[PDB]
RNA sequence: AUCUAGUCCGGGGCAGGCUGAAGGUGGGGGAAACCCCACUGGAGGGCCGAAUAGGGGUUCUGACGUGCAAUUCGUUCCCUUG
RNA sequence: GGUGCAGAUCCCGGCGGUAGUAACAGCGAAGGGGGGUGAGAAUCCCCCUCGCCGGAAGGGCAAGGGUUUCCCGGCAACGUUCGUCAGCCGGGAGUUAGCGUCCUAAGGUAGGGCCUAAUAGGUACCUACCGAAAGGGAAAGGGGUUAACAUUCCCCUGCCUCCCGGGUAGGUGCGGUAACGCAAGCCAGACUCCUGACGGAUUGGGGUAGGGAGAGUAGGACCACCGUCCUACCCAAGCACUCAAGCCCUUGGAGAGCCGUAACGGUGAGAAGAGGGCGAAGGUGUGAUGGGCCUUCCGUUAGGAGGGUUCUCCUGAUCCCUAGUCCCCAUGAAAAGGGAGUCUGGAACGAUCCCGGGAGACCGUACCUAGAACCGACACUGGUGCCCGGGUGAGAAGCCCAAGGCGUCUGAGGGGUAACCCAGGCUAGGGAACUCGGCAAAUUAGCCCCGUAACUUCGGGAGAAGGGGUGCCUAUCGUGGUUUAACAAAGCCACGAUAGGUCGCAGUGACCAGAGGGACCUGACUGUUUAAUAAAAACAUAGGUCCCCGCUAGCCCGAAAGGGUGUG
C-alpha cells in the first residue's frame, strides 16, 4: 500500500521531464501491481513500474503515466506543487 | 607413534578413491539365463585398467562392458 | 610466509556466516553447520554444562 | 573556492583526460557559477571552458629515416642487428614462399600447355628435393 | 566479468563510418546437435545460436533427413 | 585378453610413473621407511641406516607391526 | 642410432637400446589383418589399431597389431 | 556489488546507520557534548556482519 | 547524415527479358571487390529481384560466369561491361551523386 | 584445512628466441649390402632469456634490525610446455 | 573484624628523567613563478611552465569493506607538518533490466532402514533435496540525457518466450536422377537419435583490433632560415546477400605413372578434369537526409547561420574460425535445456508463415581495487588477483615519448656541505702479496662468418676453445611478399647481400648484454623439502630383487553396520 510521496531535487525533472513518479510503497516482497494500486486511488493510467531497495530502509519504484495523464497535475492535486 | 602410511589409507579418505566417472564402467558379465548373440559395436580406454575394454549391443537390447580380447574388432558377432 | 603474507590471503568469505538463530556470524557454510546456534544437526539448542567458568 | 565540478565535468563533456583541461585565467567569476552539464555544455561554445586539442608524436624524422631506411640500404647490414640470424627472418616461411612460387609457376606451365605431364613430374620431384633456389634459376632451367 | 570465456573477443572498427571503437562479447559456436551411434559427421541441417523457426530448412526432405546418411541406418525400416 | 608385452617398453621417466596411476589410489611416489623418523615406522630412526630387528616375524604378529618379509618361503636372488 | 637420441644423452644407452629397439615394431610398417596392408595401421593405444582404409577397430596388443 | 541480499537485503541495526546524534534532541538534554558511543567507521573497524 | 554516394544501375541482358537493378554504395571501396566477383553478388541481387515481387528462373541457371570487362571512367563516370558465355550480358553504370542537404 | 599439507572437481596462465630426434624428399658413390650430402620435417620431464609475465628465495651473513613489516628491502640466482 | 605495607621483576591510576633527543632519509618523482580565497598559506585554489610514470602510478573488471559515491557547510581532534582541504566532521540525496534465480561434479544433507543403551554417533542400501555471481544455461544494441547510477530511464532499429485476433502452406503441396532446396498441418503420446560435452604439441589458410603511407579538406603550432608536424576525416546489433577449407553428389576414366601438400600423403575401394550441394569468420547494403567529428561566423541575455567530414595504398595482432598432422601404460564431466527422426491414438481445422494485438515475476545493480578504499592492530615498500600505442629495438628486455595519471608513495627551509654511514663513479704503479676462502668487485658479453680438443652412454660435450668483420653516408643489386595481379612491369613493403666515399680513441658507441680453462671427489640428471638460522650427498625417480595373495583372497580401518585396494 502506497506510503509517501518522495520530493527530492531529482525527483522533480521527472515529474516534468519524463512524466513519472518516485513513489515508494510497502516492503512487501511480492508485487504483481504496484500498478493497479494508483488508478483507484488516482484514476490514471500506467505505462511502466522498476523495483529499488534503497540501504536505508524503504523500496523505490519509477511509475510513469500515458501522455493523456500529466502526472504534474495529480502531484498539485496532492500539493507539494 | 602417529599411524603408519599403510594405516593412512585405512581412513578411507580422499587420498585412496578413485575417479570411476572417468571410467567407462563396470565390466562385469551381464547376466543371461539362456542363449544369445551379439554384435561388437565399439571399443573404448579405461584409465585405471590396463586393459581395453568392448561395447557390446545385446541382440534383446542391452549394453554391457567385458574386457576386450585378442583378435576382436567392431561389427563381428559373439 | 608465516608472518605477515600467512595473513594476506584472508579476503575470501568468513568461513562462519550469519546463522540464522542465534545472531552470531557463525554459521560455517563449509561444514553445513553452525557451530554456534546449534541449528544443522541438533533439533534441540546447542547448551552445554560449560558456557562460562562455574 | 574548490570547484573540481567545473574541471572534472568537462573531461567527460570532450572525452579526455582531465589533466588536459584548461581554464581562462580571465573568466573564473563566470565558470563557477556553472551547476549543470547543461551549463558546461553551453560554456564551451562560448570559449569559457578551453579544451586542449590532443596533441601527438612529431614523426616527420621517422619518415625522412624509414625512407632513408628502406631504399638505399642504410643501417640494414648486418652489423647492426640486436637478434639471432632467423631472428629477423624466418627460414621456415622464406622456404613456404620459395615452394610456393615455383608450384604455381608450373601449374600454370602446365594449364597453358608450356610442358607436357612428364616435364611437370620431373620438374615437380626436384622442387620438393630442393634442387632448384630461385624462380628466376628454376625458369632458366626450363631452356635447358 | 573476470576474464572467462563466455564470449568471443570481438571489436568494431571496419564496417563503421563514426569514430568510436569498443568491445563485445557473444558466445560460442554450436554444432549439428548431441549423441552418438554412427559417429558419422553429418550435414544438411541447420544450427545457428538463434533458431528462425525455419520448419523444414533445418531438415532434408529424404526419409530420416535429419537423422543421419545412409551409412549405417537400414536396422530399423 | 589385449594388452601383450605390456611392460617390455621401460618407463624411462618417473613422469611416466606419475601418470600411470594418476587416477589408480595408489600412492605415489612411494615412500620408503627406513629413512623416515621412528615416531612414524617400525624401523624408523638411527644415524646409521640399518635394519633394526629380523624382519621375519611369528603369523600371530599385531597389526601395524608385520613389515619387510612377510611369511617369506625363501630368500636370496637363487 | 636414430630415433634412441630424441632425449638426449640421457638415463642410459643400455635403457634407451631397449626402449629402442621395442619403438620401431610399432612404427614399422605392418599388414591390416581386415582390409590389407595397403594402407598404414596406428596405435591411438595399447590394443587399439586401424588403418585410415578398412576403418575397422581392434583389439591389438601394447604395441603390436 | 553481488551481495547476496542477506546483509544489503537486511537493513538498520544490520548495514545501516552509524549515524550521528538528533541535532534538536542536543538542545532538549542540554547535554555538554552529546555522542552515540555506538559510534564505529568503515576504515578502523570491522562490522561483525 | 552521410555524404556523397555511388549509385549503380546494372542492366542485365539475357534471352529477349531485360533486368535492372538498384543498390548503392559508401566508400569507393566497395566497388570493386563488388566487381571482384560479382557472380555470388549479382546472382544474389537477381534472386533478391525474384524475392523482392515474384516470378522464378529468370537467369538463374547461369553457369560460371566470365568476369567482365576492365572498370572505365570519363566523366569520372565508371563503366564497364560484364558477358557471360552465350546470350547473357549486363551492362554497369555508375553515378556519384551529392546528397546536399 | 580463508594459511599451510594433500587430493579431487571445475577454471585461468607461461612475451621471444634457440637447438633440431624420428620420418619424408632429392641428389651423389658403387648391381648389391647400403653410405655421404642437401633440404623438408617439427618429437623432447632439452637450452637462453621479460624487476611486478609468473615461481622459488641463492650470495651479498648487503640496509633496516626500539622496521616500510612480530620476517622485509635492494642487490645478487636458478625454473619457465612441464 | 575483609583490619595497620616499601617492596611481592605486585595490580591499577597519575607523572617523572633520558628531552624537543630519535625519527618525520634510504625502495631512483620535483617543482618554480605569478594571481585568488580566507584570520592564518611551502602544503588549499586559478594560470603557465617543468619533471616523473607510462605491459604500469593507465584502463576495466571480483570476494570485502557498507556509504568508502555525490552535493552543501565546516575544522577541536582525526591527517606522521600545516591546513580554508580530504576517504574527517556536520546538513541533505543516490543504484530500476521480458535481453542470481535453473541444472549438475567433486561431494553433502534429510528421511526410511543396519548398528549405537542413548544420542546433536556411524551409516555400505533406498528415496528426496542442497551444492558454481569464471561449469552449462532464450533472447539488444546503438547512439542520447543528470553532480551522483545505467546495455534498465528518452528515440530507432530490434530480438526472444508465452498468450490472443486474420488470412496462408498444410490434413488434399512441391523441382530436379540425386546430393538437397522450401511458408512444413494440429495435439496427445511413446521410443530413439542427433551439438550441447570437454587434453596437449605443432603448422597453414582465411579473417579482425590496433596501426601506418599520400593527396585533399579546416585548425594549431610553427620561424635565426626552412617548411614541417599534430589535429578530425567515421556508424553496432538485428535484418538481405555473400564465401574457404572440409565433407558429400553426379559425370568421368588413369601406372611404369599420375594428383597434391608447409609437411604427412591421395590414387582402380575411382586419381585427374568437368559440372554441383551442404555450407565459418568475416565483409558488403540497410539502420543512418538521425546523431557523432572537427570547424567558421554572427550572436554574445537568449541563442542563431554555414562548411566540410574524401580518395588511393601498406603492414598487421598474444584478438577470432578453419583446417589439417603428431603425442598418450595421462585419452581428457556429467545434467538439465534444445532440435530432429520413427510408430500409435485423436478431432478437422490449421500452423515451427507472416500480419495485427497483449504480457513477461522476485532479487543482484553506488563506489574501490589497492604505494590511502581488502587483509596484515595504521593513510603499512607484505600479500590477494585477473585481463589489455610509436619509435628504438627479436622482443611484454632496457630508454624515451604517445593515451591517461601524478608533483600525497605526504612534513619542510638554510648552508663553501666537517667527520662519518649507506648508496655510487674513478684511481697512477705492482697485480691475490689481503684473504680460512678471489668474498667482493672487476673482465667478457648482442650478432654474422670462419673455426672447435680429450672423453663418452655416439645422443653430446659444444656460445668447448680460438680468430675475423660490425659505424655514417652516396649509391646500387638480389630475394620474397602484397595490390582483381602465372610470370613480368607500376606503386608499396619486408628481408639479404655488393661497391664506393667518408669520421672518430672508441663503431652490439648508450642501453641490453657468459669470464674462461684444467685436475679431483660426491650425487645419475629435471624435480622436492627444514615458512621465521640450514636446498644438500636428505627424499622420489627410472631398474633390478624378494615377500603375501586366487576374491567369501590378500591388505589394511571402526563399537557395529561394514569401509575402502573394488566400476579391479
Not at chain 1, 46 to 75: C, F, H, M, R, W
Not at chain 3, 43 to 54: E, P, T, V
Not at chain 4, 126 to 135: E, P, Q, S, V, W
Request: net charge positive; proline share 4%; aromatic share 8%.
Amino acid at each position: 500500500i502506497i506510503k509517501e510521496f518522495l520530493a527530492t531535487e531529482k525527483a522533480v525533472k521527472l515529474i516534468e521531464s519524463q512524466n513519472t513518479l518516485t513513489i515508494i510503497v510497502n516492503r512487501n516482497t511480492t508485487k504483481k501491481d504496484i500498478k493497479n494500486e494508483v488508478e483507484k486511488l488516482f484514476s490514471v493510467k500506467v505505462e511502466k513500474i522498476n523495483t529499488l531497495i534503497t540501504p536505508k530502509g524503504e523500496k523505490k519504484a519509477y511509475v510513469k503515466l500515458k501522455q493523456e495523464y500529466k502526472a504534474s497535475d495529480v502531484a498539485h492535486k496532492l500539493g507539494m506543487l | 607413534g602417529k599411524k603408519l602410511l599403510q594405516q593412512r589409507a585405512g581412513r578411507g579418505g580422499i587420498n585412496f578413491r578413485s575417479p570411476s566417472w572417468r571410467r567407462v564402467g563396470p565390466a562385469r558379465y551381464p547376466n543371461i539365463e539362456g542363449d544369445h548373440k551379439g554384435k561388437i559395436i565399439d571399443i573404448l580406454h579405461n584409465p585405471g585398467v590396463t586393459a581395453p575394454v568392448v561395447k557390446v549391443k545385446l541382440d534383446n537390447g542391452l549394453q554391457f562392458y567385458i574386457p576386450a580380447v585378442q583378435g576382436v574388432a567392431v561389427g563381428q558377432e559373439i | 610466509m608465516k608472518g605477515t603474507p600467512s595473513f594476506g590471503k584472508m579476503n575470501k568469505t568468513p568461513t562462519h556466516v550469519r546463522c540464522r538463530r542465534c545472531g552470531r556470524n557463525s554459521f560455517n557454510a563449509r561444514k553445513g553447520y553452525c557451530a554456534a546456534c546449534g541449528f544443522g544437526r541438533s533439533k534441540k539448542i546447542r547448551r552445554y554444562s560449560w558456557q562460562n567458568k562455574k | 573556492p574548490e570547484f573540481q565540478l567545473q574541471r572534472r565535468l568537462a573531461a567527460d563533456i570532450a572525452g579526455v583526460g582531465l589533466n588536459n583541461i584548461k581554464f581562462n585565467p580571465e573568466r573564473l567569476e563566470e565558470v563557477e557559477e556553472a551547476l549543470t552539464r547543461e551549463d558546461i555544455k553551453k560554456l564551451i561554445k562560448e570559449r569559457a571552458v578551453i579544451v586542449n586539442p590532443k596533441r601527438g608524436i612529431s614523426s616527420g624524422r621517422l619518415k625522412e629515416r624509414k625512407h632513408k631506411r628502406r631504399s638505399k640500404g642504410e643501417g640494414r647490414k648486418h652489423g647492426s642487428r640486436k637478434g639471432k640470424s632467423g631472428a629477423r627472418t624466418g627460414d621456415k616461411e622464406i622456404w613456404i614462399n620459395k615452394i610456393r612460387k615455383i608450384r604455381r609457376y608450373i601449374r600454370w606451365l602446365r594449364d597453358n600447355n608450356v610442358i607436357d605431364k612428364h616435364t611437370y613430374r620431373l620438374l615437380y620431384k626436384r622442387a620438393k628435393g630442393n634442387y632448384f633456389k630461385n624462380l628466376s634459376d628454376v625458369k632458366s632451367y626450363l631452356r635447358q | 566479468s573476470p576474464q572467462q570465456r563466455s564470449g568471443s573477443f570481438r571489436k568494431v572498427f571496419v564496417k563503421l563510418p563514426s569514430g568510436k571503437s569498443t568491445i563485445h562479447y557473444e558466445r560460442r559456436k554450436d554444432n549439428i546437435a548431441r549423441c552418438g551411434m554412427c559417429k558419422k559427421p553429418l550435414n544438411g541441417v541447420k544450427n545457428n545460436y538463434t533458431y528462425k523457426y525455419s520448419k523444414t530448412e533445418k531438415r532434408p526432405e529424404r526419409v530420416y533427413g535429419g537423422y543421419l546418411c545412409h551409412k549405417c541406418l537400414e536396422s530399423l525400416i | 585378453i589385449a594388452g601383450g608385452g605390456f611392460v617390455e617398453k621401460p618407463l624411462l621417466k618417473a613422469g611416466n610413473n606419475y601418470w600411470k596411476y594418476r587416477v589408480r589410489a595408489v600412492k605415489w611416489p612411494v615412500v620408503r621407511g627406513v629413512a623416515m623418523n621412528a615416531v612414524s615406522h617400525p624401523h624408523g630412526g638411527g644415524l646409521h641406516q640399518s635394519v633394526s630387528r629380523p624382519s621375519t616375524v611369528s603369523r600371530n604378529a599385531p597389526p601395524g607391526r608385520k613389515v619387510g618379509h612377510i611369511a617369506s618361503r625363501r630368500t636370496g636372488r637363487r | 642410432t636414430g630415433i634412441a637420441g630424441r632425449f638426449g644423452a640421457r638415463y642410459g644407452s643400455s635403457t634407451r637400446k631397449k626402449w629402442k629397439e621395442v619403438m620401431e615394431r610399432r612404427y614399422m610398417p605392418h599388414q591390416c589383418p581386415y582390409c590389407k596392408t595397403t594402407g598404414k595401421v596406428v596405435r591411438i593405444a595399447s590394443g587399439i589399431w586401424y588403418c585410415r582404409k578398412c576403418e575397422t577397430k581392434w583389439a591389438g596388443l601394447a604395441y603390436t597389431p | 556489488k553481488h551481495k547476496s541480499l542477506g546483509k544489503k537485503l537486511r537493513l538498520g541495526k544490520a548495514l545501516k546507520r552509524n549515524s550521528p546524534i538528533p541535532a534538536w534532541v542536543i538542545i532538549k538534554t542540554q547535554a555538554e557534548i552529546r555522542f552515540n558511543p555506538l559510534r564505529r567507521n568503515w576504515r578502523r573497524n570491522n562490522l561483525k556482519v | 547524415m552521410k555524404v556523397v554516394k555511388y549509385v549503380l544501375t546494372a542492366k542485365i541482358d539475357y534471352d529477349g527479358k531485360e533486368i535492372e537493378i538498384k543498390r548503392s554504395f559508401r566508400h569507393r571501396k566497395n566497388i570493386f571487390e563488388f566487381l571482384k566477383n560479382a557472380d555470388s553478388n549479382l546472382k544474389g541481387a537477381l534472386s533478391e529481384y525474384a524475392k523482392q515481387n515474384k516470378v522464378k528462373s529468370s537467369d538463374l541457371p547461369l553457369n560460371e560466369f566470365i568476369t567482365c570487362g576492365e572498370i572505365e571512367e570519363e566523366q569520372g563516370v565508371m563503366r564497364t561491361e560484364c558477358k557471360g558465355k552465350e546470350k547473357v550480358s549486363v551492362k554497369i553504370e555508375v553515378q556519384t551523386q551529392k546528397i546536399a542537404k
